[PDB]
């Protein structure tokens, strides 16, 4: 049946090429020989035999078979290399996680600088991301690695979330130490910089707010190589962490240790004056220092900017054409 994963062989796919270097293996583009559908194959190698099957992959297999959403990527099946015959101990063959092939990833479009986002295109983009995040957050799952690379999109304009390798369940009732600094520095929330270890789903929101600004500026908002440097840049725009804006900031391990040069005032509305008013308010709420005062995904979807966006009109972005390739 369709549900008996792990048995079908990778022979059933014609491998097209190398599209990414992942975390637990390389990722290849491929075509299904029977249906012709294009799929992306993530390789999982247990040959290292250090800790067996990577937990990063286990998380993706566990979570993505639970999550069903238009804006969250679909694991179609899991297939294997031709296994040795009646000798599992000798068998070191790898396993593949089959995914729907999504045409592009955000960064490649932004890095090339070929993509131009109208207000309406951004509205559709953010709404799909927020709706996918809300689904995941409602199911009490935290992405913990929101990045432009992880946001896949098709030329049709459909956006899907992708890298769930670092994702973990969150329980409000039971707070336990979690992997620190999960999100990449450029999109990392201030709480992780201060080392909460008991972080809220609001961590993903902060990253998505960073993406919102980057879509308008076409340049990432907070680019730094050091954790303290990131805090300074965030502090300049969003304001310096202070007890008045973040009553519980004093409880964070590094509050006293990590300090911005000055107690900067908030300047977000001034520096993003070019952003439409409806979107600027969303950014102010998404980029709020205190996780308890930071907006939720549902609240972003019930915002003037996104509430009246209609998903029927996907409005595809302005993607490069041959004339745009020509100079």
């Amino acid at each position: 049946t369709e549900s008996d994963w792990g048995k079908r062989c990778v022979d059933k796919f014609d491998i097209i090429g190398i599209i990414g270097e992942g975390t637990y293996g390389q990722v290849y583009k491929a075509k299904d020989k029977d249906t012709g559908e294009l799929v992306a194959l993530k390789k999982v190698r247990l040959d290292n035999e250090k800790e067996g099957f990577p937990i990063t992959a286990i998380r993706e297999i566990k979570i993505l078979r639970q999550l069903i959403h238009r804006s969250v990527v679909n694991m179609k099946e899991i297939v294997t290399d031709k296994q040795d015959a009646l000798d599992f101990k000798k068998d070191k063959g790898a396993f593949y996680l089959v995914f729907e092939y999504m045409d592009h990833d955000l960064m490649g479009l932004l890095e090339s600088g070929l993509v131009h986002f109208s207000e309406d295109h951004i509205k559709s983009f953010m709404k799909q991301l927020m709706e996918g995040l809300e689904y995941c957050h409602k199911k009490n799952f935290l992405h913990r690695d929101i990045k432009c690379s992880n946001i896949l999109l098709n030329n049709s304009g459909q956006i899907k979330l992708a890298d769930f390798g670092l994702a973990r369940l969150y329980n409000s009732e039971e707070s336990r130490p979690y992997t620190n600094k999960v999100i990449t520095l450029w999109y990392r929330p201030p709480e992780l910089l201060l080392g909460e270890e008991r972080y809220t789903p609001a961590i993903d929101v902060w990253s998505c707010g960073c993406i919102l600004g980057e879509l308008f500026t076409k340049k990432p908002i907070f680019q730094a190589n050091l954790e303290l440097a990131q805090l300074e840049l965030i502090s300049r725009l969003c304001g310096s962490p202070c007890p008045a804006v973040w009553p519980d900031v004093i409880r964070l391990p590094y509050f006293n240790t990590m300090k911005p040069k000055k107690q900067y005032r908030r300047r977000l509305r001034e520096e993003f004056s070019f952003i439409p008013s409806a979107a600027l308010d969303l950014l102010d709420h998404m980029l709020t220092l205190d996780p308890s005062k930071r907006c939720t995904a549902e609240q972003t979807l019930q915002s003037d900017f996104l509430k009246d966006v209609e998903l029927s009109k996907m409005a595809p972005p302005d993607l490069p054409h041959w004339q745009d390739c020509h100079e």
């Binding site: 090429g17 890095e111 725009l237």
Partner: protein, 826 residues
């Protein structure tokens, strides 16, 4: 890691901007000409221009304006680079010693902002109170010109109008006032604000908003006698000033878009206008004086003067002389006469300044069998299109072959003692239902001619409507003699067929040498072409014969011969064709993991593929299997404008951000993944847009030439006419020259006090990285031009490695010899 060396063989020739004023002395009339990274200073004479000084800047010159604040004897120069390095410059001369003073400097880049569509705009107040900058959408940046602002500190004023087309400071206002055209969903509008340095915000402007032409492009600021502003569009020219409104819409300007303007009479009576077809107009302001004693603008008139080169900048100098700054063609001095000549023109050319123009493609060919090699470049666009034959002999000798149409590609066919050149010309939908060319050109003046009669796409049934006056491109293959450079034959391709690639080669067991062209059927409706051809021609006995045609489902962007087979890139697909004994192309194998295979290069059974954005790919042809294998790919996403193979392991690429990078096989076989990963080991911001990489050298080889430290030779052509050269180094030689650069940068004084390390830093709107793996040979070659005290200061405590003495101290005379050898590679 990899070690490479980059030098300029020909400096940028295209004119990016030009201004006049009193910069070198309050008495002389100056002409400052800005080429990319180069500033040229001239003094105006009665015969022409006297050059006085040229400086290079570590940055692309984006803004260039002369101004004279109260208290100065002479004009000061403001320059802003494309990386947002601002400076104020002063000319100072002590007898025979000429130097440029940096009076103020700083970087005005904002942390958060959206770069504007119409690019950086810089303007200066008529009272020289402030510098206005339009860098980002929704923001207006003000640098106040007070005596104390030596760091050029500035503030931003929120600007409600997000999409600004053009802005100028107005003349005749009680306060500093800006007039600008902006676009919102309701069309384009003209609007004014007053700028308050005290309040640091805009105040209500002197006159109300007026709706203007949908394609209103430029704002002309009228001087005090009239005041107000003029707005130039596609169809109309309008004057605005409070309650006064004028509009002239002469049919002559509708034909071609006007791109440049300048003021002939300081009082504003006469302005000059130029258009994309090279025509030069005079815009006349017809005064009417009232008994009140006030002077008002009665009417506007436009008069056609003649034809100039397609000009990026015009500047009227004195008497009848105008300097025409051309980016797409050769620049000029022309004289405007009061009496027309017998053809009806008032414009007569005086001098012509060589502009290599946009170098779309180029090849190196030893025409005279000299072992040297000469560079034939596809240069210019439209009427300025040309083939330029360049040889070394101390200056470069350049020959110009006028084509009067755009040359797309070039390839040399020795067997036929001729070149094949792809070209396109502009025709316009005429009343016959066909099209008419605006002027005769190479494809129409061929000795013999032919037109494709291919029936491949003839089934059509796809409607493409034509409106009178619309432009079309007509593509041709030109056969051009290598000695006379006379057009022997022109072959015209199908209607709406664009020629994208050209090779000359033998295939298979066929002894004939063919011209092969890859095309794309381009229809405005299609974002990406879905039809195309590969056409095999034979040039024999003065005629071009169609030998075979292969239909493809896309655009043949690039082709390259591969060991008797034809390697062609059709959209995403990279395909290898065999040439059968029946003289038809037969597909052998395909590769498909490419967004769009814009560029192709081959070495052995290896192929370098350049995606538009997933960077470079190292393919290999596996003959035992009859198919391709992916060897390794550059996973950092970068746009590609041109690629080249340096050696079996190193690969060179150019980004559209004016950045050069080198990728290498990771050469670690522990894991398959490492080998499949291509590591960018070289990063270098060039400052030019590279279109063509080409193996070869222009230096004369008598076989007596001392073996230079540099190994290899790649020439590249750029949009601004700059020709450069990339070559490799050993680790020892790199370290020596790199350590020397760091020493030279501390010694050499930069114009605008721009850090050299910053200038070469790989920079994209998103990223900035320090340069690596590249030696700025233009910096190294400047060691020979610095004074003796500076030379000895540079060589202090400098040690070599692996020489006769493992640690060998350097002297100023030793390094002079080393650099002098390095100057001999071009």
């Amino acid at each position: 890691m990899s070690y490479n060396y980059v030098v300029t063989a020909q400096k940028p020739t295209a004119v990016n901007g030009c201004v006049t004023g009193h910069f070198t002395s309050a008495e002389d009339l100056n002409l400052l000409i800005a080429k990319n990274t180069r500033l040229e200073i001239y003094v105006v004479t009665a015969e022409g221009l006297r050059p006085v000084k040229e400086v290079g800047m570590y940055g692309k010159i984006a803004v260039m304006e002369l101004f004279r604040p109260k208290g100065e004897s002479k004009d000061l120069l403001f320059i802003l680079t494309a990386k947002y390095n601002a400076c104020i410059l002063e000319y100072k001369q002590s007898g025979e010693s000429i130097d440029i003073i940096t009076r103020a400097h700083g970087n005005v880049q904002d942390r958060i902002g959206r770069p504007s569509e119409t690019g950086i705009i810089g303007i200066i107040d008529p009272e020289c109170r402030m510098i206005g900058l339009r860098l980002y959408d929704g923001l207006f940046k003000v640098i106040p010109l007070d005596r104390d602002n030596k760091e050029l500190k500035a503030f931003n004023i929120r600007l409600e109008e997000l999409h600004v087309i053009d802005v100028k400071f107005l003349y005749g206002c009680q306060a500093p006032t800006i007039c600008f055209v902006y676009q919102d969903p309701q069309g384009r509008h003209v609007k004014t604000y007053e700028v308050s340095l005290r309040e640091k915000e805009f105040n209500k402007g002197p006159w109300k908003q007026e709706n203007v032409e949908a394609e209103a492009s430029m704002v002309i600021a009228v001087p005090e006698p009239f005041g107000g502003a003029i707005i130039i569009g596609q169809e109309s020219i309008t004057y605005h000033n409070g309650d006064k409104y004028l509009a002239i819409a002469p049919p002559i300007i509708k034909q071609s878009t006007i791109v440049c303007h300048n003021r002939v009479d300081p009082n504003g009576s006469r302005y000059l206008l130029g258009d994309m077809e090279g025509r030069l107009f005079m815009l006349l302001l017809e005064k009417e004086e009232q008994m009140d004693g006030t002077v008002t603008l009665k009417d506007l008139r436009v008069e056609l003067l003649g034809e100039t080169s397609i000009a990026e900048c015009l500047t009227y100098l004195d008497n009848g002389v105008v300097f025409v700054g051309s980016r797409l063609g050769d620049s000029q001095l022309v004289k405007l006469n009061v009496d027309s000549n017998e053809q009806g023109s008032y414009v007569v050319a005086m001098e012509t300044f060589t502009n290599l123009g946009p170098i779309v493609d180029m090849c190196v060919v030893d025409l005279e069998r000299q072992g040297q090699g000469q560079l034939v470049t596809c240069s210019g666009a439209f009427k300025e299109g040309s083939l330029r034959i360049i040889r070394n002999g101390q200056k470069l000798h350049i020959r110009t072959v006028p084509l009067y149409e755009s040359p797309r590609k070039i390839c040399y066919q020795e067997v036929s003692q001729c070149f094949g050149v792809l070209s396109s010309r502009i025709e316009v939908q005429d009343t016959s239902g066909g099209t008419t060319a605006l002027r005769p050109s190479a494809s129409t003046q061929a000795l013999s001619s032919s037109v494709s009669s291919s029936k491949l796409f003839s089934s059509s049934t796809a409607p493409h409507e034509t409106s009178f006056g619309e432009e079309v491109e007509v593509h041709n293959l030109l056969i051009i003699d290598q000695h006379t450079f006379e057009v022997l034959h022109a072959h015209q391709f199908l209607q709406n067929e664009y020629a994208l690639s050209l090779v000359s080669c033998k295939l298979g067991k066929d002894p004939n040498t063919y011209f092969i062209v890859g095309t794309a059927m381009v229809y405005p409706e299609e974002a990406e072409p879905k039809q195309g051809r590969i056409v095999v021609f034979q040039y024999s006995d003065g005629k071009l014969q169609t030998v075979a045609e292969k239909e493809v489902k896309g655009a043949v962007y690039s082709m390259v011969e591969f060991n008797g087979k034809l390697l062609a890139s059709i959209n995403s697909t990279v395909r290898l064709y065999e040439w059968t004994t029946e003289k038809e192309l037969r597909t052998e194998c395909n590769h498909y993991n490419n967004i769009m295979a814009l560029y192709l290069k081959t070495k052995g059974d290896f192929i370098l593929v350049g995606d538009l954005m997933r960077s470079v790919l190292l393919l290999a042809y596996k003959p035992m299997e009859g198919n391709f294998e992916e060897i390794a790919r550059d996973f950092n996403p970068n746009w590609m404008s041109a690629v080249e193979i340096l050696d079996d392991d190193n690969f060179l690429g150019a980004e559209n951000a004016f950045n050069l990078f080198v990728c290498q096989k990771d050469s670690a076989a522990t894991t398959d993944e490492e080998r499949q990963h291509l590591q960018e080991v070289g990063l270098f911001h060039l400052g030019e847009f590279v279109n063509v990489f080409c193996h070869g050298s222009l230096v004369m080889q008598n076989l007596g030439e001392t073996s230079t430290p540099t190994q290899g030779s790649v020439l590249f052509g750029t949009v601004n006419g700059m020709i450069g050269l990339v070559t490799s180094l050993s680790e020892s030689w790199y370290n020596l020259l790199l350590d020397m650069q760091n020493r030279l940068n501390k010694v050499i004084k930069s114009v605008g006090k721009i850090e050299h390390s910053f200038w070469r830093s790989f920079h994209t709107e998103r990223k900035t990285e320090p340069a690596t793996g590249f030696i700025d040979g233009d910096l190294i070659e400047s060691f020979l031009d610095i004074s003796r005290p500076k030379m000895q200061e540079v060589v202090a405590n400098l040690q070599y490695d692996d020489g006769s003495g493992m640690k060998r101290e350097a002297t100023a005379d030793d390094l002079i010899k080393v650099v002098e050898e390095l100057t001999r590679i071009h």
